[PDB]
Design a protein around this nucleic acid. Structure first.
Ligand SMILES: [Mg+2]
Ligand SMILES: [Mg+2]
Ligand SMILES: [Mg+2]
Ligand SMILES: [Mg+2]
Ligand SMILES: [Mg+2]
Ligand SMILES: [Mg+2]
Ligand SMILES: [Mg+2]
Ligand SMILES: [Mg+2]
Ligand SMILES: [Mg+2]
Ligand SMILES: [Mg+2]
Ligand SMILES: [Mg+2]
Ligand SMILES: [Mg+2]
Ligand SMILES: [Mg+2]
Ligand SMILES: [Mg+2]
Ligand SMILES: [Mg+2]
Ligand SMILES: [Mg+2]
Ligand SMILES: [Mg+2]
Ligand SMILES: [Mg+2]
Ligand SMILES: [Mg+2]
Ligand SMILES: [Mg+2]
Ligand SMILES: [Mg+2]
Ligand SMILES: [Mg+2]
Ligand SMILES: [Mg+2]
Ligand SMILES: [Mg+2]
Ligand SMILES: [Mg+2]
Ligand SMILES: [Mg+2]
Ligand SMILES: [Mg+2]
Ligand SMILES: [Mg+2]
Ligand SMILES: [Mg+2]
Ligand SMILES: [Mg+2]
Ligand SMILES: [Mg+2]
Ligand SMILES: [Mg+2]
Ligand SMILES: [Mg+2]
Ligand SMILES: [Mg+2]
Ligand SMILES: [Mg+2]
Ligand SMILES: [Mg+2]
Lengths: 116, 56, 92, 136, 75
RNA sequence: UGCCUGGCGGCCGUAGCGCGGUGGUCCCACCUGACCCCAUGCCGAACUCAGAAGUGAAACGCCGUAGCGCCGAUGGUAGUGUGGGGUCUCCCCAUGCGAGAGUAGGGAACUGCCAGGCAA
RNA sequence: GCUCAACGGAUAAAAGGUACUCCGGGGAUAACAGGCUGAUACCGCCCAAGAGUUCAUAUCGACGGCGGUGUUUGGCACCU
RNA sequence: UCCUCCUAAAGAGUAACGGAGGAGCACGAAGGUUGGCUAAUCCUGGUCGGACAUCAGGAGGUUAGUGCAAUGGCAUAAGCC
RNA sequence: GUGAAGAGGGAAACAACCCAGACCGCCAGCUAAGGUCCCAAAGUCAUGGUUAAGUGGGAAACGAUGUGGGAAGGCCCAGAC
């Protein structure tokens, strides 16, 4: 069972980060598709959300689940987040090891404008 | 509405609490008709020393 | 197997013991969608009624304020050493 | 002579024999010997009572013992002063409250039952009574 | 006799109880293992000691999947 | 509007197990291979990347089931604060408070923020 | 730089005898006797497995139990 | 002298020549941090190999582990690389 | 809590038990514990029962047609003990 191993891997960062009261950028990498969303410090309501599941994003891209797509999501989070009125957030990788698609998302997020 | 309290026993071999409660009611010595207004507190203070007091 | 039983008004340790020391003892009826009803009843009768086995199986028609309630004796609290009943749990 | 086969601790506090017992109903057998009075049975008394019971009802009649000592009693040696440690363990005792069923018995008549328990009850220090298992 | 030794007592337990107002830095609970856990505006010292990280009143609660006593502060 | 999934919670067992089925239009899950980025203290099993032929087999989600765990009165019982009394290694009475255990029953949950796709 | 461990460390440095004794005190603390207690002791009883040719109870009486006395060995240290 | 449990009467504290146990250190990795893993004990199979070495799965699930006593802790692991 | 450091009344006498806290006086009254036939202040008081042991006015296991109370079941006019 992967999921339950990934949750307890991700719990420390979550509990540590929610204690400070930081607006956190949560990411969920799937084998096909990738999800990203900014959650309020209370940990209840989503401020901004973005993924390759949206047809506006999917019609432009070639394949939905790679670095050059995750970068385009990471950009789309940053472009919305500035319009909504957000700038300072904290990245929550959520068990997924920071290296590939998530790094391509993060780099694309902080290259675009979002501040973390 | 008033309630006339009286002391009917000694305050000698009593507990510090019960020596205090009489001090709160204003019962100095045996045979002392005091009058206090009826409240939830005062009835609690009577009830706390019910043995050594009387209501009128 | 009819027993004339009274409804309680006082209840608690102080009441239960004053009752239990008067050739009577407390019991209770419950079960179904109806409300649970507390019972005062005579000791001497119910002490003799439980001699037979039928008491712990058959239906008992307990008479209360005219009305006959059909019940079965679920549980009973024996007195620690003396041969006597402290409490009965009747089920409807 | 009954005794705990190994324990956590050697010496135990005196405590206080208080309240009422739990093993009140006759569980296994048909008849039993209930303790009316308060007290404490030694390991010797239980054996001594069991011997007198078993011998009264012959080979037949199954017996159960509900009590077990598991509480070591100390004693100071003779001609020794107070203090200087706690005394050494002499005998073991079960504390007995009112309404503790001590012994049970099954596979005999009520006529021959009571006569067995009357012999046992004489060996014990506690005031006792005969009791019967009832259907609920 | 191979007995008659004992340590000095520590003065452990709770010092500030539910609803009591505390100042930043005040010790709330002084315990050995984390029997109480740090919540909002509470830290945990190297001695497993729960102390206020802000001014306000003490709130004892029970939360989490495994069900543990969390201490928190709200101003 | 509902019917479904996904993440994120809240609530921390009436919410969890064992059984009984059921989902693949998307969705997720195996899956698919491994110039590559990265990976193994041996291993693409794990993490990772490139993917889109398959099956919903494992896992999951949902529906139904009490076979369990769990929740749980009313009444009584133990205990006990205060003041008395006794036959005073322990009990009893007035007056508060009042368990645990147990029983009748309830019970396989319940709801927030966005994101898709199907009947409109 | 100290088992200053007699661990708030009296000195850097310290064991014994006294029936040859002495002074100051103490019934704050022992020996004798008294007191309180009664484990022990001694004296009774309860149960009755057996002994007693047979038959527990003429005489005995295991295993255990319940008392009395203040006659032992003691405990306590209340009087001196 | 110091530490842990009980005595200790559900805040702290609490005596006895009361009941049980320990310490007079250890470590430049056994500290720091970042990424990943999760135990005991059984069961069945398998060369030398047996009740027990190493391997594979399944049951159990934290009955382990925590540099040294006991207590209170620990899966977000304070456990293990 | 009391004594110590608190007298007084009661428990025959009895620091610590029960009742109650003495500023001084009075040949006044009402009460607490405890009492009320005589020593010795006050009920040979009233109502219905218990005890016959001088219990009351030291005590256990255990023993026994001692005696006073309710509640059920056993047997009779085919006439029981
Ligand atoms: Mg008094
Ligand atoms: Mg109540
Ligand atoms: Mg101490
Ligand atoms: Mg300490
Ligand atoms: Mg399936
Ligand atoms: Mg209740
Ligand atoms: Mg309950
Ligand atoms: Mg010193
Ligand atoms: Mg010191
Ligand atoms: Mg000479
Ligand atoms: Mg000289
Ligand atoms: Mg001299
Ligand atoms: Mg002296
Ligand atoms: Mg003296
Ligand atoms: Mg002295
Ligand atoms: Mg001295
Ligand atoms: Mg002497
Ligand atoms: Mg003498
Ligand atoms: Mg002597
Ligand atoms: Mg002495
Ligand atoms: Mg002394
Ligand atoms: Mg003298
Ligand atoms: Mg304490
Ligand atoms: Mg306390
Ligand atoms: Mg000590
Ligand atoms: Mg880590
Ligand atoms: Mg570490
Ligand atoms: Mg003095
Ligand atoms: Mg007088
Ligand atoms: Mg006099
Ligand atoms: Mg005296
Ligand atoms: Mg007294
Ligand atoms: Mg009195
Ligand atoms: Mg008189
Ligand atoms: Mg005179
Ligand atoms: Mg007179």
């Amino acid at each position: 069972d992967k999921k339950s191993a990934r949750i307890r891997r991700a719990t420390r960062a979550r509990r540590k980060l929610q204690e400070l009261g930081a607006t956190r950028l949560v990411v969920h990498r799937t084998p096909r598709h990738i999800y990203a969303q900014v959650i309020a410090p209370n940990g209840s309501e989503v401020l901004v959300a973005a993924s390759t599941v949206e047809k506006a994003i999917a019609e432009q891209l070639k394949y939905t689940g790679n670095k050059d797509a995750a970068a385009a999501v990471g950009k789309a989070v940053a472009e919305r987040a500035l319009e909504k009125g957000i700038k300072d957030v904290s990245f929550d990788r959520s068990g997924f090891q920071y290296h590939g698609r998530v790094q391509a998302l993060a780099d694309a997020a902080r290259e675009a404008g979002l501040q973390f | 509405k008033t309630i006339k309290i009286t002391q009917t026993r000694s305050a000698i071999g009593r507990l510090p609490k019960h020596k205090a409660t009489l001090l709160g009611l204003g019962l100095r010595r045996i045979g002392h008709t005091v009058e206090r207004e009826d409240t939830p507190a005062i009835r609690g203070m009577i009830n706390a020393v019910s043995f050594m007091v009387k209501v009128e | 197997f009819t027993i004339n039983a009274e409804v309680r008004k006082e209840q608690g340790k102080g009441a239960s013991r004053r009752l239990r020391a008067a050739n009577k003892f407390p019991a209770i009826i419950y079960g179904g969608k109806e409300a649970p009803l507390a019972i005062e009843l005579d000791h001497d009768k119910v002490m003799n009624m439980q001699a037979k086995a039928e008491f712990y199986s058959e239906v008992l028609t307990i008479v209360v304020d005219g009305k006959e309630i059909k019940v079965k004796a679920q549980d009973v609290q024996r007195h620690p050493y003396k041969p006597k009943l402290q409490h009965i749990d009747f089920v409807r | 002579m009954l005794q705990p086969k190994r324990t956590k601790f050697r010496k135990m506090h005196k405590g206080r024999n208080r309240g009422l017992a739990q093993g009140t109903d006759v569980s296994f057998g048909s008849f039993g010997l209930k303790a009316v009075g308060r007290g404490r049975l030694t390991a010797r008394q239980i054996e001594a009572a069991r011997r007198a019971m078993t011998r009264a009802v012959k080979r037949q009649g199954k017996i159960w013992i509900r009590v077990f000592p598991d509480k070591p009693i100390t004693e100071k040696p003779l001609a020794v002063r107070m203090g200087k440690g706690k005394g050494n363990v002499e005998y073991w005792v079960a504390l007995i409250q009112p309404g503790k069923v001590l012994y049970e018995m099954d596979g005999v008549p009520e006529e021959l039952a009571r006569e067995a328990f009357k012999l046992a009850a004489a060996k014990l220090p506690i005031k006792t009574t005969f009791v019967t298992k009832t259907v609920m | 006799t191979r007995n008659g030794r004992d340590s000095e007592a520590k003065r452990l337990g709770v010092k500030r109880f539910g609803g009591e107002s505390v100042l930043a830095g005040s010790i709330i609970v002084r315990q050995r293992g984390t029997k109480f856990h740090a919540g909002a505006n509470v830290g945990c010292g190297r001695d497993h000691t729960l102390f206020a990280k802000a001014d306000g009143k003490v709130k004892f609660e029970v939360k989490g999947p495994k069900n543990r006593k969390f201490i928190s502060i709200e101003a």
